[PDB]
Design a protein around this ligand. Structure first.
Ligand SMILES: NS(=O)(=O)c1nnc(NS(=O)(=O)c2ccccc2)s1
Ligand SMILES: [Zn+2]
Length: 257
């Protein structure tokens, strides 16, 4: 099965998922001097006041926090988007060391981790249909740097011991993702793909300029998770990030100058 090890990592994915060598794969390095300011881009509208989290799951390559998306509770609109996108899950990618872990990079700089808030376009009726469309998903990406603790993250950090191995899940209600956002919503955007198999090219990426800071202790707890199932030999869940892919015939646009 695919994963992040030496024998089944990103460099091998293309044998089972040939779209890995596609025209708009992600992630990609954001060159801040060649990104184009676009004054036509609108501010992001993040409406998370009615979000309903349900549970947290270790899926063997990350942990997902899942939300109820049966109704327009937590939605993303505006920015480069047309239409309403519903939040369905968030997850992180992180490194074994503080100098790596993010998927996108900024002028080749890597961050300690990257938060992905995944949303789908409600005009396609369900998530499975949305992932088959070029504008079906919108993922909000937020960088994490190591510094002062993020109070909003601690609820997540404290439950990780309950889902240490693959396939474990726990109830995770009344979590407010607003506590994970930076102060500013300035962003870069480009058309891209999921960064894990099946690597579908259905994503409008929105990457926030301002990182959030988390403490060393907080990220350390991430690194104690396991890729393996219970009873299996222990493999720590670290470096679950895909390297930057070529930009090809794409333009990254900036919401700010
Ligand atoms: N890193 S990333 O692109 O946001 C994603 N990686 N895995 C994801 N999972 S997911 O959206 O629930 C998903 C699950 C099944 C098929 C397509 C997408 S999103
Ligand atoms: Zn992701």
């Amino acid at each position: 099965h695919w994963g992040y090890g030496k024998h089944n990592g990103p460099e091998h994915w293309h044998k089972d998922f040939p779209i890995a060598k596609g025209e708009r794969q992600s992630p990609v390095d954001i060159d801040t001097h060649t990104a184009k300011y676009d004054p036509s881009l609108k501010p992001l509208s993040v409406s998370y006041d009615q979000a309903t989290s349900l549970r947290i799951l270790n899926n063997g390559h990350a942990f997902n926090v899942e939300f109820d998306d049966s109704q327009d509770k937590a939605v993303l609109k505006g920015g480069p988007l047309d239409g309403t996108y519903r939040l369905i899950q968030f997850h992180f990618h992180w490194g074994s060391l503080d100098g790596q872990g993010s998927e996108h990079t900024v002028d080749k700089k890597k961050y300690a981790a990257e938060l992905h808030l995944v949303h789908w376009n409600t005009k396609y009726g369900d998530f499975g249909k949305a992932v088959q469309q070029p504008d079906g998903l919108a993922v909000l990406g937020i960088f994490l740097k190591v510094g002062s603790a993020k109070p909003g993250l601690q609820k997540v950090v404290d439950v990780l011991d309950s889902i240490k191995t693959k396939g474990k899940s726990a109830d995770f209600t009344n979590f407010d993702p607003r506590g994970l956002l930076p102060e500013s919503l300035d962003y870069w955007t480009y058309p891209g793909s999921l960064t894990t198999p099946p690597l579908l090219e259905c994503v409008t990426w929105i990457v926030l300029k301002e990182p959030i800071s988390v403490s060393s202790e907080q990220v350390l707890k991430f690194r104690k998770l396991n890729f393996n199932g219970e009873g299996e030999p222990e493999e720590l869940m670290v470096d679950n990030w895909r390297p930057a892919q070529p930009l090809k015939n794409r333009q990254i646009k900036a919401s700010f100058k």
